[PDB]
Design a protein around this ligand. Structure first.
Ligand code: COA
Ligand code: COA
Length: 293
């Protein structure tokens, strides 16, 4: 008999592959997994945010907290489907709550696989917020496009006013960091900000972040006034074919949404939903009375 609880501030390489093996076992049974931020896990973070639960040399539970907002934190938590309703989740949370009360936390955000937990979550005071589709296009075949009607080019530092017009109309979350954020993106060769123009009028954009064997798509936008014309599909088509020409076949795209109709164009250019996570909110004091402290 042996139980062991490790609480640290950085996931080492072998711990990471134990965590990924446990997560894959949960994907086997749950149809999906919570959202993990691997770059944050393997980073030396200021506090002890990771909790690993072992039983006879076996990783059975894992929790990590991410401090994104001010009074809110995101929690990714998994327990071996073969060892559930044994209190492993309350043990992991008991471990982390001293850190949470010290940071003055008031609200917890849990990422969860869809459907399977809906009824007991809502019956315990959790509130659904949104969902996230982690998409991948893995085919080697390019997109065969009709007559191109857009001119598409890499944005230089001289397209900032157009980039800021696009952001103002589509990405209000960057309002007051926008010029300085663009100045760094445009002077980083691992980022390509594609500008789409129809008859010399700029109609939208899309970002590609190049990695050594992947390409990460983000910040796709067509102005609402221009969204009927087929330009969103042409722009994204062009970016896909650019990544394939560049020798990257793992194309990533993450979409936060509460309705699946925001997936129509992407799935139709060959992206598929590799994982879906739901995000539920609960007041911290309510969680520690429904779960014994
Ligand atoms: S201020 C602008 C804010 N930006 C966003 O919210 C970013 C995400 N969406 C977009 O930038 C545009 O909605 C995209 C997805 C690029 C579509 O632009 P377009 O409307 O120009 O693209 P097409 O005309 O080529 O495509 C029409 C086809 O696909 C589905 N569609 C509409 N809206 C979406 C969204 N939001 N997500 C996925 N698919 C979407 C449609 O089926 C639309 O086709 P129909 O002919 O309308 O059936
Ligand atoms: C829930 C999970 C995260 C931990 O489960 P666990 O170790 O089985 O949790 P516990 O045994 O600590 O039980 C704690 C509270 O679970 C709630 N809970 C867990 N599973 C539940 C279920 N299937 N139905 C109702 N409540 C459940 C209860 O309040 C349980 O309380 P009780 O048994 O004392 O009444 C596990 O089901 C899992 O890893 N699921 C997949 C990942 C996921 O959904 N993460 C999101 C968590 S919000």
């Amino acid at each position: 008999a042996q139980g062991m609880i490790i609480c640290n501030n950085q996931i080492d390489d072998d711990q990471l592959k134990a965590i990924q093996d446990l997560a894959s076992l949960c994907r086997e049974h749950d149809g999906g997994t919570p959202t993990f931020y691997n770059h944050l896990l393997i980073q030396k973070r200021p506090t002890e945010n990771n909790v690993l639960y072992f039983q006879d040399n076996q990783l059975l539970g894992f929790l990590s907290v991410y401090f994104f907002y001010e009074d809110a934190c995101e929690v990714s938590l998994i327990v071996s489907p073969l060892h559930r309703r044994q209190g492993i989740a309350k043990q992991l949370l008991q471990t982390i709550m001293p850190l949470l009360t010290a940071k003055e936390m008031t609200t917890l955000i849990f990422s969860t696989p869809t459907e399977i937990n809906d009824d007991w979550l809502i019956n315990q005071g959790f509130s659904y917020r949104n969902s996230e589709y982690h998409m991948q296009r893995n085919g080697y075949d390019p997109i065969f496009m009709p007559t191109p009607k857009l001119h598409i080019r890499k944005a230089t530092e001289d397209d900032i006013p157009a980039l800021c017009a696009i952001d103002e109309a589509c990405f209000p979350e960057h309002q007051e960091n926008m010029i300085s954020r663009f100045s760094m993106l445009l002077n980083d060769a691992s980022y390509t900000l594609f500008l789409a123009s129809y008859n010399h009028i700029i109609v939208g954009k899309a970002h590609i972040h190049w990695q050594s064997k992947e390409a990460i798509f983000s910040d796709i936008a067509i102005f609402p006034q221009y969204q009927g014309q087929g330009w969103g599909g042409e722009l994204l088509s062009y970016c896909i074919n650019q990544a394939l020409t560049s020798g990257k076949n793992k194309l990533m795209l993450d979409v936060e949404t509460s309705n699946q109709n925001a997936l129509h164009l992407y799935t139709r250019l060959g992206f598929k939903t590799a994982n879906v996570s739901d995000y539920w909110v609960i007041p911290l004091p309510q969680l520690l009375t429904n779960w014994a402290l």
